A paper describes a structure:
HIV-1 reverse transcriptase (RT) copies the viral ~10-kilobase ssRNA genome to a dsDNA in a multistep process. For the DNA synthesis, RT binds an eighteen-base-pair stretch of a duplex substrate with the primer 3′-end nucleotide occupying the priming site (P site). A dNTP complementing the first template overhang binds the N site and the nucleotide part is catalytically incorporated by RT at the 3′-end of the primer with the release of pyrophosphate. Following each nucleotide incorporation, the DNA is translocated from N to P site to accommodate the next dNTP.
Fragment 048 is smaller in size and contains two rings—a cyclopropyl and a pyrazole. The cyclopropyl group is the only chemical moiety common to both fragments 048 and 166, and the cyclopropyl group occupies a common area of P-pocket in both structures, despite that two fragments fill different parts of the pocket. The cyclopropyl ring is positioned over the YMDD motif in the pocket, and like 166, fragment 048 binding knocks out the active site Mg2+ ion. The 4-bromopyrazole ring interacts with the residues Y115 and Q151 and points toward the dNTP-binding site (or N site). The 4-bromopyrazole moiety is stacked against Y115 sidechain and the bromine atom interacts with the Q151 sidechain. The pocket rearrangement is less extensive for accommodating 048 compared with 166, which indicates elasticity of this transient P-pocket. The deoxyribose ring of the primer 3′-end nucleotide and the YMDD motif each shifts by ~1.3 Å for binding 048 when compared with the apo structure. A superposition of 166- and 048-bound RT/DNA structures suggests the potential for P-pocket to accommodating different chemical moieties at different parts. There exist multiple opportunities to design compounds with pocket-specific interactions such as pseudo A:T or G:C base-pairing and extension to reach active site, primer grip, and key residues such as Y115 and M151 that are involved in dNTP binding; binding of fragment 048 indicates the potential for acquiring interactions with Y115 and M151.
Numbering used by the authors:
A (entry chain B): 5 to 88, 95 to 428
B (entry chain A): 0 to 554
The structure:
DNA sequence: ATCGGCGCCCGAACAGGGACTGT
DNA sequence: ACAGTCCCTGTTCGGGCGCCG
């Protein structure tokens, strides 16, 4: 099997990303993995004459004890050439299962002229040894080009199964295979095992989940149910009595929401605050204002019209820390034209680790974007750059890594959760 | 040491470039006879070969005294060749720290002699290392040579030797998997748990193993007895310390001198607990003249006394025990300054350090504490590969009320409270609901973008008003100035309504210190108050008192 | 004068991005 | 809707320290 020629985008060099510090737990797992990959000819040792590097770290597999080597191929994927239909029914299925088929990529060799770009460096504790550098000789997991180069082989493996079960939707994104069906959960999990064993005739899958009865906290990102994803409506308070401070919070909230919902008006409400009153003064709603409020409640309940997904424009997701373990998010392409607004709560821990919360929400938001649109969004994270970077690898369990930036948001986005 | 039999690393020039063509600059007579005498020696030693007119490249050559040695070091100003050499990925990712060393029965520190001069250079690249020795008589043309080994001063030499040394040690490390060898350039920390007799046997196998690879371990650089001088430390069997620090004593100081003093004080903070450099680094602000003389401030001189005070007492570090828990404790010394000590058994510090970074223009002590915890967390991963347990001078309930009320995601790993004052506290707390029976202040401010003049005032529900004219100000400052007025002209309980997200986001973050003088005044007022409720309304929407004061300041 | 590679600290120029404002 | 100014945050490079050739 001959390798497919791969180029970088015109005028771009390879990745040169420093390796970040790793725990002894992750280095010992990585050293074992890379030493074994060199024996099977999957990687090979290189020297410092290769000026490229990509960060590597390890994650614990889903409901398992085995370790998975994860490459931060974000920079390489941005500089890799583009290659050459998304199933809209996958998001409508009852149950959807994510299968790590990244192991299949390790059977196709990579173009020699390109291998210099897959270099990574394994660090050592206390800088005992210099970094030992490796490069890839086969298609690597997490590479933008790996699913594309393997595309011809993946359709061939699945075509018999897809004709034997035409009601099952199969989408592929990077190392993961998304398998959706409308069967019952028990007959669905048997169908997943039917796909795994029929696939086993060609390429292997991650060791079967040590559990099969959905042990809680463990199949969050494994067995997904898209038909139960809910959008988060914008709500207004319901009070018998409104104060001047209460009307000001209401007017400011409605004025911000007029950017997402066209018909929002605040004029009859602002008329109630025409003086220079005390904040605690109760303001009775006039008959005209009660109607305006009642109409704004109606406007926020109806869905927004004329907002469609553009495959050429990047997706952007914003998360707000609402407190009490609750996180609100919005996915959009143009400002105030949200493609989905959701809420995630009660995540991991008894609401102790904020970072674990944010990391899970980012993964669940990305999973929805892959399932819904087949893309990944760019995240605007409500966290300090160093607070995330220090800890995020400790709670990551996806085979893909989305792009993100860090922002310090003013506390005036109370416009998403009551 | 014959040239090592290790394979050369293929080295290329940057795409579409040629080699260096630099003419040789004049040298002193002490160096001319020494370079000629040296060059024929290192041609005889094989490191250098003569070249002819077919080689069109050149690089200037000189010769300086070796660092703390009677031997001469042959150096070349390869600044032109380094710009044309390909980039490398440096495999040296950091510096080993003694606090990460475990206890060993037998320890040996080696040093390879003529390190760079033992490793061959890629044959294809040798043409570009050509140089010319100008003779004394200007009538003589001068003798041209090229390099067969790693030159000192070439940008690829450190990375290639580091990569080459690991390849040379890989077979020996595999023949003996239980011996730990800390490798940094040519210096080798060898440690084992074998008996002292059998340990010296393995060192000779290593010296013979390195000798087979053209790597001599001279006896002059072979240390067999504690104390060990390693990586600038004095290593003792159960304790470690830093080689003597010499702080300069001068009556008048310059910018450069201050730059040195800050650096040495940082280098001492790894084991000396309590080093402070904030006031000493303040003297480095603005002046880029390296030879400028700076008078020591009253606060700066006080800082030097504290450091010298804790430097008169000897401090030692302990080695690391992988079986026992890692503990770090932090204390708040000055404003924006912190010191920490990492230990396992109390009062037996592995290492110390300090964090004194001002992140942002507006911050509080709780933010800096989380910033210092992160610096220690990363540092602990580098040295020991694990996160330490923390002992912080902040109340358990103080942090609970902060991270639940802060809009950003903040987290601190497993930590326990220590009662080591001064503690970290939230100096004031904004009310969640408007205060009943509190004068409501509708504040705003404006400024012209060309004139830079502006107004700042307030209107209240009790009818009280005020407008102050300001000169040399901005829109952001006048809107901040309006909130300051309401705090001044109010009682201990006040309701303030602003239209500035910028002023609101600063105050709502509960800062206790700021680079802005005005914010420090606003913070001071909030601590004096007893209950403060700050509300925001959208501007230019005809809302309450915001509309009245908006017209007051825009005119 | 007159060198290379790494890590760290601290200070300052430059850029990016988002908000306000003026046209 | 375009183009500015302010403010903030982060990146890179300059100085110093230390290691090694």
């Amino acid at each position: 099997i001959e390798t497919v020629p791969v180029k970088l985008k015109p005028g771009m060099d390879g990745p040169k990303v420093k390796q970040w510090p790793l725990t002894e737990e992750k280095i010992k797992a990585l050293v074992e993995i890379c030493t074994e990959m060199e024996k099977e000819g999957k990687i090979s040792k290189i020297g410092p004459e290769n000026p490229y590097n990509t960060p590597v770290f390890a994650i614990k597999k889903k409901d398992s004890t085995k370790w998975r080597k994860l490459v931060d191929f974000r920079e390489l994927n941005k500089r890799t050439q583009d290659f050459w239909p998304h199933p809209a029914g996958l998001k409508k299925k009852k149950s959807v299962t994510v299968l790590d088929v990244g192991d299949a990529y390790f059977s196709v060799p990579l173009d020699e002229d390109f291998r210099k770009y897959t270099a990574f460096t394994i660090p050592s504790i206390n800088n005992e040894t210099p970094g030992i550098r490796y490069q890839y000789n086969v298609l690597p997991q997490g590479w933008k080009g790996s699913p594309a180069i393997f595309q011809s082989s993946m359709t061939k493996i699945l075509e018999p199964f897809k004709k034997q079960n035409p009601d099952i939707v199969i989408y592929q994104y990077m190392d993961d295979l998304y398998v959706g069906s409308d069967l019952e959960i028990g007959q669905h999990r048997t169908k997943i095992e039917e796909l795994r064993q029929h696939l086993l005739r060609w390429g292997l899958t991650t060791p079967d989940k040590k559990h099969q009865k959905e042990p809680p906290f463990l199949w969050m990102g494994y067995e997904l149910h898209p038909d139960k994803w809910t959008v988060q409506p914008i709500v207004l308070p319901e009070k018998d009595s409104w104060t001047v401070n209460d009307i000001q919070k209401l007017v400011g909230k409605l004025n911000w929401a007029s950017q997402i919902y066209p018909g929002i008006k605040v004029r009859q409400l602002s008329k109630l605050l025409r003086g220079t009153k005390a904040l605690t003064e109760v303001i009775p709603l006039t008959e005209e204002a009660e109607l305006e409020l009642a109409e704004n409640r109606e406007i926020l309940k109806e869905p927004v019209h004329g907002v469609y997904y553009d495959p050429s424009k990047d997706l952007i997701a914003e998360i707000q820390k609402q407190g009490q373990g609750q996180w609100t998010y919005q996915i959009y392409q143009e400002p105030f034209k949200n493609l989905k607004t959701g809420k995630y709560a009660r995540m991991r821990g008894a609401h102790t680790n904020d970072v674990k919360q944010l990391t899970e929400a980012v993964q669940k938001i990305t999973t929805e974007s892959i399932v819904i649109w087949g893309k990944t969004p760019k995240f605007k994270l409500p966290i300090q750059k160093e607070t995330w970077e220090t800890w995020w690898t400790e709670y990551w369990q996806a085979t893909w890594i989305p792009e993100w930036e860090f922002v310090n948001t003013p506390p005036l986005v109370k416009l998403w959760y009551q | 040491v014959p040239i090592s039999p290790i394979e050369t690393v293929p080295v290329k020039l940057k795409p579409g470039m040629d080699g260096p063509k630099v003419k040789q600059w004049p040298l002193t007579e002490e160096k001319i006879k020494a370079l000629v005498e040296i060059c024929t020696e290192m041609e005889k030693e094989g490191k250098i070969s003569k070249i002819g007119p077919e080689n069109p490249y050149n690089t200037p050559v000189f010769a300086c005294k070796k660092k703390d040695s009677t031997k001469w070091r042959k150096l070349v100003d390869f600044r032109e060749l380094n710009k044309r050499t390909q980039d490398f990925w440096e495999v040296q990712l950091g510096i080993p720290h003694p606090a990460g060393l475990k206890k060993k029965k037998s320890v040996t520190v080696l040093d390879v002699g003529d390190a760079y001069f033992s490793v061959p250079l890629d044959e294809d690249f040798r043409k570009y290392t050509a140089f010319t020795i100008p003779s004394i008589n200007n009538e003589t043309p001068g003798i041209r040579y090229q390099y067969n080994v790693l030159p000192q001063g070439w940008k690829g030499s450190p990375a290639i030797f580091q990569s080459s040394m690991t390849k040379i040690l890989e077979p020996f490390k595999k023949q003996n998997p239980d011996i730990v060898i800390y490798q940094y350039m040519d210096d080798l920390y060898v440690g084992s748990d074998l008996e002292i007799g059998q340990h010296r046997t393995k060192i000779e196998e290593l010296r013979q193993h390195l000798l087979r690879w053209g790597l001599t371990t001279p006896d002059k650089k072979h240390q067999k007895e504690p104390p060990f001088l390693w990586m600038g430390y004095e290593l003792h069997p159960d304790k470690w310390t830093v080689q003597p620090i010499v702080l300069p004593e001068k009556d008048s100081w310059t910018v450069n001198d201050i730059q040195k003093l800050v650096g040495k004080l940082n280098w001492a903070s790894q084991i000396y607990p309590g080093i402070k450099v904030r006031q000493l680094s303040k003297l480095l602000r603005g002046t880029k003249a390296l030879t400028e003389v700076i008078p020591l401030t009253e606060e700066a001189e006080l800082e030097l006394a504290e450091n010298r005070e804790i430097l008169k007492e000897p401090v030692h570090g302990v080695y690391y025990d992988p079986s026992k828990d890692l503990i770090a404790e932090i204390q708040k010394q000055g404003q924006g300054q912190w010191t920490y000590q990492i230990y396992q058994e109390p009062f037996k510090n592995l290492k110390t350090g300090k964090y004194a970074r001002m992140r942002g223009a507006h911050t509080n002590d709780v933010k800096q504490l989380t910033e210092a915890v992160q610096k220690i967390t990363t540092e602990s991963i580098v040295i020991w590969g694990k996160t330490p347990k923390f002992k912080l001078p902040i109340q358990k309930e103080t942090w609970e009320t902060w991270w639940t009320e802060y809009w950003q995601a903040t987290w601190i790993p497993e930590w326990e409270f220590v009662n080591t004052p001064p503690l970290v506290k939230l100096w004031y707390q904004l009310e969640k609901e408007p205060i009943v029976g509190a004068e409501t202040f509708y504040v705003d401010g404006a400024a012209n973008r060309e004139t830079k003049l502006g107004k700042a005032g307030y209107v209240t529900n009790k009818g009280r008003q005020k407008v102050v004219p300001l000169t040399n100000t901005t829109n952001q400052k006048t809107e901040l100035q309006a909130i300051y007025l309401a705090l001044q002209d109010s009682g201990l309980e006040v309701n303030i309504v602003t239209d500035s997200q910028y002023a609101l986001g600063i105050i709502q973050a509960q800062p206790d210190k700021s680079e802005s003088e005005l914010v420090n005044q606003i913070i001071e007022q909030l601590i004096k108050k007893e209950k403060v409720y700050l509300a925001w309304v959208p501007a230019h929407k005809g809302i309450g008192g915001n509309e009245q004061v908006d017209k007051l300041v825009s005119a």
